[PDB]
Assembly symmetry: D2
Homo-oligomer: 284 residues x 4
């Protein structure tokens, strides 16, 4: 189970050909599960879910998809509301792979994509597990933009190694996780011109007329599946107060909060996160 | 595994002899776990934990203790702050049974007793699992007394079957759980003179000078063990806003919230509650 | 300044003729303010604002409007989502009176009407003062229905005097405000066949396909005017946790909370409310 | 009404001689109010309350006290828990001036001092007005340290002008209030060796064994006076979630929140704050 052995590609149609990179594992397994990664600079499926994919693949057929704008998937210079854009791409990949209704696991940005998908194609998504998700979160107490978003914007404006490190440090409770190796690797991926293309495309997408499609906290009362919200108590990007509207309005919701954990739950609490996910998705 | 096969007694010293009733199960098992029940009228260990004891006893040596004032344990007519009183009784039973440091599972009132115990004898308590606990909860938004406490007080004033049923109905999300059999059984236990003695003793205990010992939300920042807080989103006795101070100030806390669940999590979500407990307490 | 002297009527069109009763005062004053009353059974403009109209009329041209179903306005037996229904009637009265952009003061159900009006006719509403408003509030921690709502429901099913008194008693912090005279006066008004028709009409209106129009917490981010939210800390109908979404998403919001005050802010803290309102609305 | 005309000094005893600087105004007025300033580096009574003292002195006898470590009061290099230290100095000045029970207005760090004083000398403090107070606030959703606190820390380690400007910029919603003149004036005061000694003194004071005295959210349930909490919705130092415990547990509490306002309420909303304060304190 490595990057190379699990690597796959597919071409879907979202206003034209779009190349999606993804990782496939646990192919002999019955239940199919899609993982959607968070949206930092240099973020991709493999680095996001490295402490989780092997474990989940003993029970599930795992599909960890690099979202458009990330990893080795297409980095267009223009797109609409990002979660709708990515959800369309996922709709394409589902139909291609012949998937019917499949549970979604998404953190941060990918959580928003999972949610945006589940609202746009209700019959296609089963249970959702969502770690500090964007979109359905609305910070009732934290002034926006939060510290983490501020630091991300600062990197988008001035893409230096120092700025990138500052941003990664508010991602976690244990700052020792932020090693020189991790910063160098994230920075290399993030400072390529295509990635910079993807960052401008994201920035321009915010001025879009379809901004309302990103405010998914207005819509999640319609979700009929069970939804497991997972949060780090010390999350500085999407703080804990952001969970309240979803927890209240999603009929079959559950919330799990870990203390001494930041934005990257699937890394800082990989083990507890793996079991909660396996158990919630039915054990396989 | 029945009431009768698991039944035991012990005599401890809390200002004199005090008889504690309790249930013992899974005796061949290594890890010892104490269950502390909630504090409704007619409440006891067996009816509280009936959907949980068998399952927990496959992994643990389970001790479900009837608290003084409840079940077949002593119903004194006078006592101090209840959680301290009960925690002293538990200290006595621990020493008698030769228990060292043991994890505590308590709902509602018993959660308060578990917490009061863990603060008073730090070396004696391990991990805590606490379902909608009193004591460490402080309702930041719900005006006090809450609906459930009001209905309990109304029964204490006028102990009729109708009042008892009204109280039991705000205990659960699914009201079908409130059957005529359950009301008749709770009412029979609750309307005996000894139980009525216990209710006055509880009421008089509130006027005590040691009331501060019940405000455990002022003290829980001192807990060093991991604590799992479990809550029903629709809890009408100890509402969800009551969890926030504990979740924030207890260093190694975790919170799990179930939607479509009321005050009796261990009953309405027995299965999910059993697994979370087993997993959190180390699998046995 | 009496009921009869301030009484006025107007006939507007909302799917047919509709008679609106309302009170006019301070006609010599420069600035017009519309008061929209709270929605208990037997409630009307004059009763709701009695400790308020005289004081407000020294600074403002006051129009205190009986909402359809209340006081002497038409009590239809069937209608759609109530706040949109009531806002349509209000829109009609505005055109009739040649009003431009006018500030609205709404208590409870009236608050929802005031807000619904401001969303549906953006150019017609200025500053809002809203006391424990329905509609834009969403109770993030309190389970629905709340205790106050339940009592109202009990009354709709069994409209006895005991039930009305019990409902009014969860309306206020200081229960002495609930005098037998007040109960008797409300019960006289509330038990008329016309009033009970209007009460069932409201209840059936909840099963409507236009329910989304009642969930205004999804829309108030679009409000551009300053909004003053006033809330009593011990409000058992629309609890304080209901204020968070509006406070966060309305750009020019402000919140005032009174301790030792319930749902009836304008009565229990009439003085502080009057001063807060006058100043917020520009001194007049 | 100038700095020099209102300047006064007094010498009190807190483990030795201590010189307190303070400003006195409205001496002809009936009612005495003590203002306690906020605690940035280079902060003092006159600067904190400038848009406020003149207006307040028309109604009240105003005493705006430089807290030890600030302005022209003694800047010791070592002290215990700061609010208790500052309250002891205040207690001394009260006895010196023959004050009875006096209302306190405290901003931020001053708010904590005002509160700590009211708990330690119950008979000496009346009504409190508290703007984004430290101490009784506990941030239930925001991870500590907050963004504002972090910036202050950055300055203590590296007291450059860039760092001071960055700190003042998270103090306010409208950043235009941070003029180069203001930064220059604060930096002049804040970079003196005496000011930096006082700043380190504060930091070392946190490692103290008397830390519990700083956790006033455990104690304010004992406050019997009316307390007005004033908060800015975009406060990034003591965020709005910090108000909940005090608002709930102080029996005669009230809360006012301003949208489009940061940590410096008395500056950014000077007018609304002045009127709110004057009225709350009895018109004088
Ligand atoms: O405004 C009120 O008093 C009110 C209105 C409605 Cl629709 C309601 O259900 C309740 Cl409990 C109160
Ligand atoms: O009052 C303030 O401005 C203040 C006081 C302290 Cl002790 C502090 O750490 C910060 Cl960030 C601000």
């Amino acid at each position: 189970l490595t990057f190379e052995s699990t690597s796959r590609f597919a071409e879907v149609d979202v206003d034209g050909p779009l190349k999606l990179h993804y990782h496939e594992a646990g192919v002999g397994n019955d239940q199919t599960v899609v993982l959607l990664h968070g949206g930092g600079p240099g973020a991709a499926s493999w680095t996001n879910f490295s402490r989780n994919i092997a474990v989940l693949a003993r029970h599930f057929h795992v599909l960890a998809v690099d979202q458009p704008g990330y990893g080795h998937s297409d980095k267009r210079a223009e797109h609409g509301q990002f979660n709708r854009y990515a959800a369309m791409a996922l709709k394409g990949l589902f139909d291609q792979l012949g998937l019917g209704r499949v549970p979604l696991v998404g953190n941060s940005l990918g959580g928003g994509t999972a949610v945006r998908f589940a609202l746009d194609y209700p019959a296609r998504a089963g249970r959702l597990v969502l770690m500090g998700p964007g979109g359905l979160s609305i910070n009732l107490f934290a002034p926006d933009p939060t510290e983490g978003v501020k630091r991300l914007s600062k990197f988008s404006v001035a893409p230096t190694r120092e700025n990138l490190e500052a941003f990664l440090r508010v991602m976690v409770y244990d700052k020792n996780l932020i090693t020189p190796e991790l910063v160098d690797q994230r920075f290399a991926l993030a400072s390529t011109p295509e990635s910079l293309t993807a960052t401008r495309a994201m920035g321009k997408s915010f001025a879009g007329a379809d901004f309302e499609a990103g405010m998914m906290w207005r819509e999640v009362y319609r979700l009929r599946q069970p939804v497991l919200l997972i949060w780090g108590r010390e999350d500085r990007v999407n703080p804990l107060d952001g969970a309240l509207v979803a927890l209240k309005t999603i009929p079959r919701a559950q919330l799990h909060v870990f203390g001494q954990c930041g934005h990257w739950v699937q890394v800082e609490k990989f083990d507890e996160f793996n079991k909660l996910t396996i158990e919630f998705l039915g054990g396989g």
